[PDB]
Every structure is written in C-alpha cells, then in structure tokens.
Amino acid sequence: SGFRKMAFPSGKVEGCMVQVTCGTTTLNGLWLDDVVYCPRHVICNPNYEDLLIRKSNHNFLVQAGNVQLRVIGHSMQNCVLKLKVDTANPKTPKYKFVRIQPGQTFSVLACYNGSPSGVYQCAMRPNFTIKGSFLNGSCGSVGFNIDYDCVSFCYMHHMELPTGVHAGTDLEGNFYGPFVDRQTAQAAGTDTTITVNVLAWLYAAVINGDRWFLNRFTTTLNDFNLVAMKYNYEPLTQDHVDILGPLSAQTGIAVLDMCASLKELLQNGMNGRTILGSALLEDEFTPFDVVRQCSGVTF
Amino acid sequence: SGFRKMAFPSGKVEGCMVQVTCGTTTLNGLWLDDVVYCPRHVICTSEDMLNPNYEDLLIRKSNHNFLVQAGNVQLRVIGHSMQNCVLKLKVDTANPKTPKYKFVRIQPGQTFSVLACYNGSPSGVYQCAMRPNFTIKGSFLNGSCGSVGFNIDYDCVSFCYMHHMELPTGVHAGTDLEGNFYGPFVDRQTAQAAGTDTTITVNVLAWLYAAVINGDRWFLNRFTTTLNDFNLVAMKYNYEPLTQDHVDILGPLSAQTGIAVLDMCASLKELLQNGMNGRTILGSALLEDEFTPFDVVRQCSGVTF
Numbered sequence: 227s228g229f230r231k232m233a234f235p236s237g238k239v240e241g242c243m244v245q246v247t248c249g250t251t252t253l254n255g256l257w258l259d260d261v262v263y264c265p266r267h268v269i270c271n272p273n274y275e276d277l278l279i280r281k282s283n284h285n286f287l288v289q290a291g292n293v294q295l296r297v298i299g300h301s302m303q304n305c306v307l308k309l310k311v312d313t314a315n316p317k318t319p320k321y322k323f324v325r326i327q328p329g330q331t332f333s334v335l336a337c338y339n340g341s342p343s344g345v346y347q348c349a350m351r352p353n354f355t356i357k358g359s360f361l362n363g364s365c366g367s368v369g370f371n372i373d374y375d376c377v378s379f380c381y382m383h384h385m386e387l388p389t390g391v392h393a394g395t396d397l398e399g400n401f402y403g404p405f406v407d408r409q410t411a412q413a414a415g416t417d418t419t420i421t422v423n424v425l426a427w428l429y430a431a432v433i434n435g436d437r438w439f440l441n442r443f444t445t446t447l448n449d450f451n452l453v454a455m456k457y458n459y460e461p462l463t464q465d466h467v468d469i470l471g472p473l474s475a476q477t478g479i480a481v482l483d484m485c486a487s488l489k490e491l492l493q494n495g496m497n498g499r500t501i502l503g504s505a506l507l508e509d510e511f512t513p514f515d516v517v518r519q520c521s522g523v524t525f
Numbered sequence: 526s527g528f529r530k531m532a533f534p535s536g537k538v539e540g541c542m543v544q545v546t547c548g549t550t551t552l553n554g555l556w557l558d559d560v561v562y563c564p565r566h567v568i569c570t571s572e573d574m575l576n577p578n579y580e581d582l583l584i585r586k587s588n589h590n591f592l593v594q595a596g597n598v599q600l601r602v603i604g605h606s607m608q609n610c611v612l613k614l615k616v617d618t619a620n621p622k623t624p625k626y627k628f629v630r631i632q633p634g635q636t637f638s639v640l641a642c643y644n645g646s647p648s649g650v651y652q653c654a655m656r657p658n659f660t661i662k663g664s665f666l667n668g669s670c671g672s673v674g675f676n677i678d679y680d681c682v683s684f685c686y687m688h689h690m691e692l693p694t695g696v697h698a699g700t701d702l703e704g705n706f707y708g709p710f711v712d713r714q715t716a717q718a719a720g721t722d723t724t725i726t727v728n729v730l731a732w733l734y735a736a737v738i739n740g741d742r743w744f745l746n747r748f749t750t751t752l753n754d755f756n757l758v759a760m761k762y763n764y765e766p767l768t769q770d771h772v773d774i775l776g777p778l779s780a781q782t783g784i785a786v787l788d789m790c791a792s793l794k795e796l797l798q799n800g801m802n803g804r805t806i807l808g809s810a811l812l813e814d815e816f817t818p819f820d821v822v823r824q825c826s827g828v829t830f
C-alpha cells in the first residue's frame with residue numbers, strides 16, 4: 227500500500243556527471259564513453275559557430291570528481307556542445323538518447339558543480355516546460371528513464387523562464403517547445419492538464435481503496451472531450467483509452483465510466499475530501515507509472 | 526525557483542542492496558563491509574509470526590541456511606548474530622562499494638529518502654517523513670522488507686530506517702539500523718494499530734517560509750500570537766505542539782525573510798480557520814508537513830524573491 231511520486235534509482239546517472247568550466251561560466255556535463263555533453267551556452271545575439279571557432283580545446287576545463295579530463299576535440303549539435311575527451315568513462319552504462327512526448331514523465335538528477343544533490347520525478351507539460359526545482363549552476367542536469375538495465379536520456383536543463391518553470395533540450399540539442407537558448411523575451415504558453423494521467427491516478431486510488439468518487443454512470447468520448455475542453459484539460463484520444471485498458475480490466479471500471487467520475491469532479495469539486503492524500507487532481511503519473519508502482523518492477 | 530519533494534541521489538545505497546533467503550522467505554539486506562543487515566523475521570514462517578520466539582528459531586539455524594545474493598554472485602555466510610530486531614549476517618567478502626556511513630536514530634518530524642527494493646533489486650526512490658505516531662506513509666509491496674531509509678550528508682550516508690511491516694491502515698513500521706523499532710510496535714502479527722496521527726507544525730511553518738522565499742505572500746496577515754495561544758488553536762486542528770526548540774530552529778528562515786516566527790504562526794492560525802479559498806501555496810491545495818527547516822534551507826535560494 228501507499229502511493230508516492232517515485233523516481234528511478236539514480237546511480238547509473240550519478241557516475242556520468244562532470245563539471246564543465248569555460249571562462250567564468252561553470253555548469254554540468256554528461257560523460258558517456260569519450261564524449262562530454264553540455265549546453266552550448268557555456269561558451270557565452272550569440273552566433274554560436276563564430277564563438278566556438280575562437281575557442282581551443284584547452285579553454286574547456288572538465289572535472290570528473292577530483293580528476294581533470296583532457297579535452298581533445300569539440301563540436302556542436304543543435305544546442306548541445308560535444309567535448310571529445312582523452313578518457314572513456316569506465317562507469318558508462320548501457321544507454322540511448324530518446325525524445326519524449328508532452329505528458330510523459332521522467333527522473334531528474336539535479337547537479338551543481340558536477341555533483342548530484344537530489345533526484346525528483348516530473349512530467350513534460352503540454353506547453354513543453356517542466357515544473358522543476360533548480361538554482362543557478364543547475365544547467366546541464368539531466369532527465370532520464372530506466373528500461374530494464376538501459377538508461378534512456380531524454381532531457382538536459384538549459385534555462386528558467388520568468389514564471390519559475392524550466393526549459394531544455396533532448397540529448398541531441400533540440401529544444402522541447404518554442405524556446406531559444408538566449409536572453410530574450412520568452413514566456414511559457416497557457417498550460418493544460420494531462421487527462422490520461424489524471425485517469426491513471428484515479429485508477430491508482432481505486433487500487434489503494436479510495437472509491438468515493440465512483441458513480442453508476444458512463445459517458446461518450448465526444449461528450450467527455452466537450453466537458454474537458456471547458457476545464458483546460460488535454461483532449462482524450464482513443465489511443466489514451468486503449469492505453470488505460472489494463473487498469474480498466476483490473477479494477478472493473480471502464481475508461482468512459484471513470485471519465486464520468488472525472489466529469490463530476492470537475493463540475494462539483496472534492497467537497498472537503500482528498501484522493502491519495504491530495505486535494506487537487508494529480509496529472510504527473512502516467513498509466514505505465516501506475517502499473518509499475520502497483521507491481522514492483524526492479525532495475 | 527521551484528519547490529519539489531526531492532530525494533537524495535541513491536547510487537551509494539544501490540551498491541549495498543542484496544537478496545536474503547531463508548527457507549521460503551526472501552527479502553532485502555544491506556551489505557556494508559563484511560556484514561549483511563536484514564529484518565530478523567526472515568527466519569519466521571507465517572504461523573511463527575503470531576508469537577515468535579526468535580532466540581529459539583535462531584539457535585536452530587546454521588550459516589548455510591542463509592542464502593545471500595549480491596547481483597549474480599552468491600555470498601558465503603560465515604557467522605550470524607541478532608541485535609534487537611535486526612539479523613546480522615557475517616559474510617566472507619567485504620562490499621567494495623561500501624560508502625562512508627553512520628547509523629543514526631531519527632526523531633518524528635525528520636525526513637529521509639527511501640530506496641524501495643524487491644529481490645535485492647532497487648526499483649524506486651522517494652522522499653518521506655517519520656510521522657509523529659512513528660509510522661511512515663510509504664509505497665511498499667510484498668517483498669519490500671529490508672528496504673532502507675537514508676540521508677546523504679556531504680558524502681556520508683546516514684542510515685536511519687529499515688522496513689519491517691505494513692499496518693492494517695496501509696502505513697509502514699520499521700526499525701533503526703540497530704534493530705530498535707520506531708513506535709510501540711513489535712515484529713509480531715499481533716493486533717497493533719497506528720495511533721491517531723498529527724500534523725508536523727514546525728515543518729508546515731518551514732514550508733510557509735519556503736513559499737515566501739519563492740515570492741508568495743498572499744497568506745500573511747498583520748497579526749501576531751503568543752506561543753501558548755498558537756498551541757491552544759493548533760491542538761484543535763490535530764497539529765503537533767510547537768516548542769521553543771522549534772521556534773529557535775526557525776530562526777535563520779525568520780531572519781532571511783524578515784517575518785518573525787510568531788507572526789508566521791499567526792498566518793498559519795488564519796489558514797487553519799479560513800482554508801485556501803481556491804488558492805494554492807507552492808502548487809499545493811493542502812498544508813505540506815514533509816519538508817523540515819533544514820530541507821527548506823538546503824533546497825531554496827539564499828535570496829528571497
């Protein structure tokens with residue numbers, strides 16, 4: 227019993243964190259094999275190819291623990307800088323670089339000066355921002371998921387927006403969202419609630435003995451989406467319905483029956499009650515996170 | 526900016542998790558140097574759990590009855606002893622991944638990270654607090670026994686909890702790493718229940734200071750209170766009494782934000798009376814009590830917004 231916001235064990239990622247210094251700027255890098263990946267703004271209207279050509283290998287100071295790494299080459303891929311080093315990381319795990327979709331969750335290992343300080347779970351919001359916990363020096367901290375023994379790197383931290391939310395790239399340097407890496411007027415778009423995730427979280431509450439919000443009613447997908455659009459909820463697709471299939475069979479509550487419960491909660495509120503110790507509808511647990519936490523899958 | 530429930534990086538702890546099997550029971554152990562620490566109920570049957578005589582059960586076991594597995598490698602048990610509710614298995618190999626560590630017994634209100642394991646394999650990490658009734662609200666399934674709670678101070682791992690059992694309400698009970706239970710619980714299948722729980726007042730205050738540091742002041746008021754009057758009001762909402770120690774502990778946060786501790790107590794009194802009125806504090810519609818004053822100072826900035 228119990229339902230917590232749970233992150234993946236961070237050990238395989240901790241062994242990859244390094245400190246990267248260039249001039250006055252100091253941030254974090256990801257050391258995999260003989261390459262260190264970090265945000266290209268470490269070299270900072272910035273013409274990045276023009277600023278990079280002026281730099282030489284010895285301008286980049288890389289520190290792995292108490293050991294200095296020797297930079298032997300450098301290249302840029304989109305908004306990521308790739309520093310070729312002399313030593314291959316002996317702690318390199320089996321890994322992939324993956325691009326996630328909004329609504330998908332991941333673990334963040336927050337670092338300062340190449341040293342990991344914390345791990346937390348979060349989701350890629352529909353507006354492509356993440357609600358993280360980051361201070362100055364956190365740039366280069368990474369987002370990941372673990373699938374069996376393979377680490378899938380999905381996010382690298384680049385910046386904080388004026389509302390306190392965060393923006394970054396995949397490990398190939400492509401930003402999530404209509405953001406750019408530079409000091410300019412940038413704002414997050416209007417956010418929405420991840421509907422498939424709230425439904426998964428309602429199924430997790432049923433599994434844990436919270437059935438007060440269930441009713442005898444069902445709905446149509448069309449009628450549910452007309453109601454969900456009024457509350458700034460993401461549209462629910464037939465793919466989302468198919469994805470919730472296992473949870474529906476386990477609890478005996480069909481997705482459109484649970485949708486009628488969500489509809490009543492949106493129009494009436496909680497009435498002094500909580501669901502899994504929360505007075506808000508939680509949208510940062512995917513259907514796979516619910517199944518994984520309510521089955522005990524190990525890494 | 527931002528405020529998340531943050532756990533410590535788990536790597537130093539992952540390298541200590543092993544699987545311990547005795548007969549039909551399989552649970553987790555903590556391998557530090559040449560000793561594996563695990564709950565003593567690993568020697569029990571489900572029948573035995575009603576009134577186990579652990580000393581009588583242990584005297585009948587030999588070293589080779591305990592199967593210890595570290596990854597895909599079998600460890601050889603060369604000795605065994607019991608310390609309170611923990612079994613200590615002497616093994617023939619020292620853990621090369623043993624970090625710098627301490628065994629610490631915490632007090633209610635304290636927070637820590639939990640590395641939940643099944644079959645000696647870590648599956649997840651989460652942050653939680655020792656409740657005033659000595660239970661923890663964890664996320665644990667069958668086979669999680671032996672999972673540990675820890676804090677990482679500088680580069681030293683302070684082990685404070687080992688998971689032993691789930692109570693009928695879904696909450697969890699366990700021991701420190703010396704085998705002493707937190708709370709009036711026993712590692713027995715007798716009728717036990719968690720006492721009525723209360724809110725950790727000093728932690729909610731720390732969390733209100735974290736919201737002020739992050740730029741949110743809507744909940745503040747022009748009033749103050751005496752400590753006695755605050756406690757008379759707090760007791761009516763099932764809040765833990767606030768002591769002079771708690772007031773002293775909140776001193777740094779008070780100096781940083783410019784709000785006196787008893788003035789922050791006055792905002793809390795008003796929040797308890799009025800509710801949130803459709804508003805949130807740090808993305809929460811409830812008053813959060815699982816961030817200590819030390820956690821707030823660690824995660825938040827040194828400059829108030």
Ligand SMILES: COc1cc2c(NC(=O)Cc3cccc(Cl)c3)cncc2cc1F
Nearest residue numbers: 227566665666667669689690691712713714
């Ligand atoms: C078999 O069902 C579960 C067991 C769990 C568990 N194990 C025990 O409670 C075993 C036990 C029994 C009686 C006294 C003691 Cl000391 C220990 C620990 N945590 C979570 C659990 C969740 C479960 F669903």
Ligand SMILES: [Cl-]
Nearest residue numbers: 630631632635
């Ligand atoms: Cl303590």
